[PDB]
Amino acid sequence: SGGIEGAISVGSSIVGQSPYKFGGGRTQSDINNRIFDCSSFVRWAYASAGVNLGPVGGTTTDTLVGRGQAVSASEMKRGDLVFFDTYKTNGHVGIYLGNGTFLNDNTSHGVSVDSMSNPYWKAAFKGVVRRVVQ
Ligand SMILES: [Cl-]
């Protein structure tokens, strides 16, 4: 109930209820108020499940892509971090849920679940995946 499943449970608890804010989620006030961007959301979901993916103030997609172990796209598993080329290389991150979906915090929908086959996310995905819990 920890680790991967715990992070999915915490992160999902606020789906549909947490608008995105670029740069948010790197102060305790923002965390308490559920104000995050894509990478500070992922850091918080895992921290709330007992897993340290980096410092509160300094975690970004660039630091997260350096955590854990590389995974081939064909082998992506629930809990793996999936990265996408949105405004820059690896500019977006989410937590893969299985079944071609991922939990993430994005401008359009805030904290939400998106599909890897949505044409936008399919085009933006380049195969960059990181496993952070074994
Ligand atoms: Cl935290």
Curated annotation (Swiss-Prot):
Any idea which GO molecular function terms this record carries?
cysteine-type peptidase activity; endopeptidase activity
Catalytic residue positions:
C38, H92, N104
Free-text description of this protein's post-translational modifications in UniProt:
Identified in the extracellular proteome as a number of processing products of about 50 and 30 kDa.
Q: Where does the protein principally reside?
A: secreted
Mutant lacking the gene: phenotype: Disruption of the cwlO gene affects neither the vegetative cell growth rate, cell morphology, motility, sporulation frequency nor the germination frequency.
Record keywords, A-Z: Cell wall, Cell wall biogenesis/degradation, Hydrolase, Protease, Secreted, Signal, Thiol protease
Give the induction note: Positively regulated by the two-component system YycFG.
GO (cellular component) term, any one: extracellular region
Q: What's a GO biological-process term for it?
A: cell wall organization
Q: Which cell locations does it reside in?
A: Secreted; Secreted, Cell wall
Could you confirm whether the keyword Cell wall biogenesis/degradation appears in this record?
A: yes
Domain NlpC/P60, first and last residues per copy: 1-132
Q: Reply yes or no: does the keyword Hydrolase apply.
A: yes
Q: Which family does it belong to?
A: Belongs to the peptidase C40 family.
Q: What does this protein do?
A: The C-terminal part of CwlO shows a cell wall hydrolytic DL-endopeptidase activity.
Q: What else is known?
A: The N-terminal part of CwlO was shown to have no cell wall-binding activity.
Its name, as the record gives it, is Peptidoglycan DL-endopeptidase CwlO
Instruction: Please give the organism.
Output: Bacillus subtilis (strain 168)
Q: Which gene encodes it?
A: cwlO
What stretch of the whole protein does this chain cover? 340 to 473 of 473
